[PDB]
A paper describes a structure:
The packaging of cargo transmembrane proteins into COPII-coated vesicles entails a direct interaction between COPII protein and cytoplasmically-oriented ER export signals. About a half dozen export signals have been identified to date, almost all comprising short peptide motifs, all of them binding to the Sec24 subunit of the COPII inner coat. The ΦC export signal was identified in studies of p24-family and ERGIC-53 proteins, and comprises a C-terminal signature of a pair of hydrophobic residues or a single terminal valine residue. The ΦC motif contacts a site on Sec24a that is also the binding site for the LxxLE- and DxE-class export motifs.
Notably, 4-PBA has a structural formula that resembles the cytoplasmic ER export signal of p24 proteins—one or two C-terminal hydrophobic residues, termed the ΦC motif. As an initial test of the hypothesis that 4-PBA targets the COPII coat, crystals of Sec23a/Sec24a•Sec22b were equilibrated with solutions containing 4-PBA at concentrations of 1, 15 and 50 mM. Difference Fourier maps calculated from X-ray diffraction data show clear evidence for binding of 4-PBA to the B site of Sec24a. (F–I) Residual (Fo-Fc) electron density (2.8 Å resolution, 2.3 σ contour, no phase bias) at the B site for crystals soaked in 4-PBA at the indicated concentrations. In summary, the crystallographic result gives evidence that 4-PBA binds the COPII coat at relevant concentrations of the small molecule.
Numbering used by the authors:
A (entry chain A): 3 to 205, 223 to 464, 474 to 537, 541 to 666, 679 to 723, 746 to 764
B (entry chain C): 1 to 23, 29 to 132, 148 to 157
C (entry chain B): 346 to 466, 476 to 662, 666 to 882, 888 to 1093
Amino acid sequence: TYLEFIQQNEERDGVRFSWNVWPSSRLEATRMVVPVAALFTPLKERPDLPPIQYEPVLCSRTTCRAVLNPLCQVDYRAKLWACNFCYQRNQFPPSYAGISELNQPAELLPQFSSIEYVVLRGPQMPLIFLYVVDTCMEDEDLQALKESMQMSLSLLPPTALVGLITFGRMVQVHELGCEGISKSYVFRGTKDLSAKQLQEMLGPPPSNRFLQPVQKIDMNLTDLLGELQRDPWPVPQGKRPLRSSGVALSIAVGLLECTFPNTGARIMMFIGGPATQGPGMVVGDELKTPIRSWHDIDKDNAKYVKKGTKHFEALANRAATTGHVIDIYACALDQTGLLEMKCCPNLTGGYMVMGDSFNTSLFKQTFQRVFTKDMHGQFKMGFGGTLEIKTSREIKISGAIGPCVSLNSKGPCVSENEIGTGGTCQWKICGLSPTTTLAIYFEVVGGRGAIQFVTQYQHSSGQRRIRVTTIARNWADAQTQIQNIAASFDQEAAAILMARLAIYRAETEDVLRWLDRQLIRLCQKFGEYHKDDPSSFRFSETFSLYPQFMFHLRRSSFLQVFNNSPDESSYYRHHFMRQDLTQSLIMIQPILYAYSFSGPPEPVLLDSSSILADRILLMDTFFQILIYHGETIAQENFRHLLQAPVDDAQEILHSRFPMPRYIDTEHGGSQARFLLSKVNDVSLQVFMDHLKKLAVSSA
Amino acid sequence: MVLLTMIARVADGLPLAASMQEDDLQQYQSQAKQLFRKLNEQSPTRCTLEAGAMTFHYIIEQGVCYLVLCEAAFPKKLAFAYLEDLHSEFDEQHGKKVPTVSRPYSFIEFDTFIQKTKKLYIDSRARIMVANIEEVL
Amino acid sequence: EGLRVVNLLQERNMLPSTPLKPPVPNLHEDIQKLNCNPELFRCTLTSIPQTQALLNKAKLPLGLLLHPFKDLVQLPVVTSSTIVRCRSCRTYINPFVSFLDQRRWKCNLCYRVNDVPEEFLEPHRRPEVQNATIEFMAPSEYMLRPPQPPVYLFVFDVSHNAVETGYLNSVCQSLLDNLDLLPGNTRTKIGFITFDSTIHFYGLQESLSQPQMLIVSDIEDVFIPMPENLLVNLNESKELVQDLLKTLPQMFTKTLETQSALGPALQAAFKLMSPTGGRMSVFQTQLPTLGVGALKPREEPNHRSSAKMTPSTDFYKKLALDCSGQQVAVDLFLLSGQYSDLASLGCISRYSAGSVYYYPSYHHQHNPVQVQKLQKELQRYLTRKIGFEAVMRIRCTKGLSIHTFHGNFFVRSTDLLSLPNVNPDAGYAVQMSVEESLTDTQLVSFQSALLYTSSKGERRIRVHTLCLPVVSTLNDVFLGADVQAISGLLANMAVDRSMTASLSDARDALVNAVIDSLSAYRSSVPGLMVPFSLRLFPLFVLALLKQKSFQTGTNARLDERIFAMCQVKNQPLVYLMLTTHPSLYRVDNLSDEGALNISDRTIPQPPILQLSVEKLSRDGAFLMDAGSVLMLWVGKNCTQNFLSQVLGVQNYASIPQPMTDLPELDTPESARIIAFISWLREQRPFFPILYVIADESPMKANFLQNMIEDRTESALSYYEFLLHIQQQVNK
Ligand SMILES: O=C(O)CCCc1ccccc1
Ligand SMILES: [Zn+2]
Ligand SMILES: [Zn+2]
């Protein structure tokens, strides 16, 4: 079963391809409607694979140097193995001398196609956590933020180094634990500083005066964090506070850049409002002028966006080059400037959290899920990840879309046609989790084409680790080319991979026109129809859902940016460009369950026809969980029904990292608008009718 | 939305208490003293004066004038609430000694309450007559 | 008792045994009895020359020396609803006006007749006319702004060298001991800054567990890091500043900061105080080398180098002028062990009406003399009275014109003196000329008036008025000469000549002032003949030429000489004389000829000896009163009764090497010497430490450097000096 195949391979190898059978010719490679691409999750969790505490064996060919994998032809008699990528034959290392066909190494069993190695050589670096705290916010928000940071302090490893930077009009770099005095270095939030400048002005396991081990400093930091008060500078009437977000971040970047370059560090910036001063300014300090909107940016009435975006884009590249993660936790009633600051968490592996106030269950719970540990008491985060991809000589890499940065590494696996962050065989991901999902786009230039994913990263323990996933997919049979290709089509994966392309072009500018020309083309090549007969059009069970996924994608808030604020659009797209397949489908097409006396809970269509008066609905947008009560139900048996969705809500309202916003509404309620807009050119029926008219007519 | 505060005896314009911080003060301090000279027993007890980008606000209670200057954008609703807080405190603490002093600024130490009260109005966080001043002068 | 001529070569013992007293102007009995106190106001020539030609003939400088804010026993305070001032020259109604109609009074400085107001009523009995010294309550128009509060900002060097000196510990202890004694009312504010390579502010809030050290590292672009709690109310936040003064000495014990950015720190301290003004106390221990205002190192001279002074930059002068315009005075405490370019650093205090205090080679363990000296000077500095935001005008009768000002201030316009602070230990001097011949008048007057804000927030005017007669005879100009005041004015003139020209010229003009005046006297009368009033003129000028300000062949170092010139420009006349020509007494045989008047105390009054080793005696002990210190020199063959009953020792060899003070033993010899010493230090408000260390072997017995009559290897004796003058007088 091709579905069993797709399920098991994602469960084992954390990957999902648009096509699992690839064009064995040049005449079908160019004529691919949806590119050969893979939704790759480099750190996916699974049923307790054995960690391999020996160095991974590597092919002895300068260019190739692939890792020993189950596709490698071995000869237990001659103690030799032949690399499946370059056909080079290799001698076994001395520790493999006692090898035998009966008892053979893990990396050769097909079960360990995805395997993790541990390299123990160098002394492990401690983790680094740099808190960057806005002080321009109401007392109830600041007090709540203070408690959240004090809580996270109690979860960090005793080895980790911590630093604290607070800011408002000025920037304060706190020197922790200094006896009876408490000091900090104060800087103007008015001019930027470079790392070399910052180093001159400022100055067994390593640590600075500004970055100290948790175990020696936690007591002084929790007292400092407890005494943090709001920015002392008064806010005059009709003014916003002077908030130097852009310079505080460039001081946090520059601080780590000159103290611990090239090692896992987390710059966690907590924002209570927009940058109103200095490089990176988002809006002026006059309350009379509102923060920019999408309408303002289209009519060229946003004089800060481009200059402010450019400032944070250079900070993102500085931090991503140095190997450091930038988080942004933003909570305020107005906008914050996420549109200008998006590249910092986007280019690194940094989180982006968005709420109304730090004094909410939403933020407090979302913030502590950052520090969720696994079955060993270790954070589910990695640092300084390096992704390298070995392909068969027939495969070339166009590029990647997701949280990563190119290492600009040239090799025969690099394609001319680049996509997203392309032109490279290697990418750096400064922060990753078991969820981080990249999209790799490939190009074809017995059977089986092979690809190997090698991910070196720093574990939360400090151990250096190498994840190796080697996959194989059959080459098309020449006498059955498109028929095998059509059967190996993953409509969900290709929908998300095509959505990745559409959003990447939108966020870096029509895009709907490209999306339709590929839907129509896919209908003609793989659909069944008589020419000029729209009613004759059918789709295989392999393709039938693809048009509907395209209907919801082209109307989603990822491409219809208006009716949302720019910070919300950048937040939505931030999380879609990171999630696995299953969660991505939820974002584009929210799941809908119905609850009534007449039967247990059942999923229903995202159509106005599913909104009944005597039925309770549960809509799972990935970003919000909504419970709707029909006009009748709005008023022991009536209790089971009223709390059946609430019970199912709580379960998923905890696994999801960005805790979704919860909504209890009903017919006539104002908040019912969120259900009425995801539900229902115009409707899908009309959309389908217009699509069939063009599929059966000219190509 | 900034400040200059002066409390003076209406009869002779004798300064009683004031408070000023810069980091000009010279021109508007003169106008303030011009006004203290003109004010008498027929003057409006509550008034507001327009001086371009600046605006004077005062009240008069028990022969004592409470004057404040600020940028015209400062809420006139707030300027008078700040003068009432000063007056009730000043009249409670020094109201009975005012008609006997003869030294200028015989209540310099009222400086302290002025500024602690002043900060409770020049920070949105904490939260009659009109005539061009050039006329009265 | 002296209209006689004196042959300086035959006397050679002309210095009297009892203290010198200032001359009495040749004035009518009733006029002189109201004249100003000569301690507060005095003139080089008590008989003013009628013409500039007569003044030029005498070859003596005409000028005034004043100590206007001196602590007084009794001060009349007029609270007049109206200040009576002459309608023309704004002179305050003074005892030396001319009441005629009695409703009209003739101004003694510009001769205009003024109408006495129906507020001043017998108008001549009014206290404004019975007191040459008086304080007025300034009206509302004598102030540019509300009276400023007392603001004290202390700026400490905390570099590696500074921490090694250990000065911070005692300064913080003095502040803790004298916190309630700082002048001011409930409006008093106080702040603190430390600095090394960066500038350290200290916020103090009652809401926080401990003070907060805010460090601005942008040395080229200093700013204020916090708006409220850097300058704090001392009354409200007394507890918070006490914890800081106990914690401050402990914060920098292990410091490796070798450089000091004094310039930017002073710019930081200026910005902090600019809004209000006040007193900035700066404590610096080494050469500033980092940032703006840096000064280059210099190699100290030796006994061999000739007379080949001025600042090396104008940064500190410019910064002082900016402080002056904002009512900020800067007092510099230099406790340096090496050259620090005080000739440039001093500009911060000269042009801001501050005062520099120098403690050469201060060390908490190594230099106990400088430790106790700083403690006693800090006691006086922190508890003496103070006036803020002040100005002083010096008026004199028409025909006399002031052309040069001496002291720590900024001369604002024609004649106006800016005094960001005024302190009771400051002295000023002025030089004048006869711009218009005084044929009309027979008296001329001088009025100084000090407008200032008191520590309690009250504008006050202190006015002193001096009246002198006019003469037209050379001999009459000599009969009224004040030898000490002429010495004081010549010292200030010689300091200016050093900066302006060289030390050689300054030394020459000093010698020429004696030759030219006595040559003029001789040309209007064999030996060296001088009038009685000038019999100490060559003696005091020689003492000037051997003082550390102007000495040549000595091993003196640069900052020592500059600090000696700073004391010339800023000390009152009495302490300039006590420093230049210290009073020497023999104290091992005191007895009853004293002032035993004081109820239960008998104070011995030993005779003043002349400054020569020929007057010493190995058989006795000699105390030298140099004004700021009291060095007690003990002879080798000193008597045994003195050792055991006064020093508390059994022999000369067991007299402790540094002896910080005498014991108070139960002997009448000890009671006598403690009575004489305590009587000496009661004559001044600046407690002078007494170290008997001067001993034969102490090697700190510079005590001999003050024997200005003996010859040294690189200077003339007093008799050699008289011989050189006579050769020049009748050349
Ligand atoms: O211009 C003036 O002289 C009056 C202001 C300065 C001053 C005040 C008091 C005394 C002397 C001088
Ligand atoms: Zn190989
Ligand atoms: Zn006059």
